[PDB]
Amino acid sequence: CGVPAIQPVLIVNGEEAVPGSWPWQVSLQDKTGFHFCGGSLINENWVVTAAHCGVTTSDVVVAGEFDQGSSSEKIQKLKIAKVFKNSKYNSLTINNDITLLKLSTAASFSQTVSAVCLPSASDDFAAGTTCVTTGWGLTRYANTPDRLQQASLPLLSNTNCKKYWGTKIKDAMICAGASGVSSCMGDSGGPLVCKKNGAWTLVGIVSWGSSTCSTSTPGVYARVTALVNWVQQTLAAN
Amino acid sequence: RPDFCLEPPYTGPCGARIIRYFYNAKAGLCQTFVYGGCRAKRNNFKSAEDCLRTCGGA
């Protein structure tokens, strides 16, 4: 996990990604092919995304995609067998914003399709650490970009984040950004990854933030370290 | 009809791109808009039918 067969070269104000350089990035679409959220493959049978995305078993997981405007591009449209929304997801505060998707048929891993690593509950990714977020969300706050985008951004300390969002920042949230880039409409559920011993590890899941996708405002993500025990437990039980 | 039917559509702070319906009093019908996934106001429906049954004529 965390090691792309195709190395990446390093969302508002981000840049186009190298095709297939973020192999765990998936597109969550409805039965018609409409992209409503992103997600991350954690293994061949499971995808992690945001609880607010409201994924259902009628939706599909699209892996190995780069250009959503290309009909010829080879991709994997995977059916969803069951949706596991974290029962602690708070629809009011948006805390514990995570959901697991168990695929009906396993994804076929390859040079453009593979898993991201998961952190340990005790992992500490220091503030200021440069991480990356990816997705097909808006690049301007309007239709989504066809090609997968990426952006490098720093993690923010809770103290620094709270300087803007105050008490809206909860324990299962981690902030990043306010650095000239911003996740935006359509990026939700996607990954916020940081390197752990060289391997890209899922530190956050795009959740919420500025209602205008401001690049000078902290973006808020579901803190994976605070939710990974729930993840492992769900996989072990299913 | 409920006054919430007269409120403009509300996307919210979450970053999803979910298609929902809202009643547009200026046009007299329900239209689509993109909902962010959280903190939906009441003029937000999963189908045009639900929207028209709740806000039609507002």
CA–CA separation, A222 vs A90, rounded Å?
12
3-state secondary structure of A3: coil
| Amino acid residing at A57 | T
Class of domain A11-22+116-225: mainly beta
Instruction: Residue B40: list chain A partners with CB under 8 A.
Output: none
For residue A187, the chain B residues in CB contact (below 8 A) are 15
- Residue A63 CA to residue A124 CA, distance in Å, equals 29
Q: Which residues of A are catalytic?
A: 52, 97, 188
- The Cα–Cα gap between A94 and A28 comes to 20
Q: Is there a contact between A184 and B37 if contact means CB atoms under 8 Å apart?
A: no
Strand blocks (E) in A57-181: 60-63, 76-85, 99-103, 130-135, 149-156, 173-177
Q: Which amino acid is at A231?
A: V
How many CB atoms within 10 Å of residue A71? 6
- CA proximity to A159, closest of A133, A182, A127: A127
Q: What is the resolution of this structure in A?
A: 1.8
Structure-solving method: X-ray
Q: How far apart are CA A27 and CA A38, in angstroms?
A: 5
User: Encoding tokens for residue B9?
Assistant: 């559509």
| Chain A CB contacts of B34 below 8 Å | 185
Residue contact A52–B13, C-beta within 8 A: no
Domain harbouring B37, CATH code? 4.10.410.10
- 3-state DSSP assignment of residue A158: helix
Domain that holds residue B6: 1-58
Check if B43 contacts A (Cβ < 8 Å). Answer: no
What is the rounded CA–CA span in Å between residue A79 and residue A57? 7
CB of B1 within 8 A of CB of B28? no
Nearest to B38 among A94, A184, A206 (CB): A94
Indicate yes or no: CB of B16 within 8 angstroms of CB of A188: yes
- Alpha-carbon distance A139 to A15, whole Å? 9
Q: Go through chain B and tell me how many residues it has.
A: 58
| C-alpha distances out from residue A95 to A88, A150, A222, B17, Å | 8, 25, 7, 19
Domain map (residue ranges) of chain A:
11-22+116-225, 23-115+226-236
A23-115+226-236 falls under which CATH superfamily?
Trypsin-like serine proteases (2.40.10.10)
Domain count, chain B: 1
Cβ-nearest to B37 among A34, A52, A211? A52
Contacts of B15 in chain A (CB under 8 A): 137, 183-188, 206-209
Whether A11-22+116-225 shares its CATH topology with A23-115+226-236 is answered: yes
Report chain B's terminal Cα–Cα distance, integer Å.
5
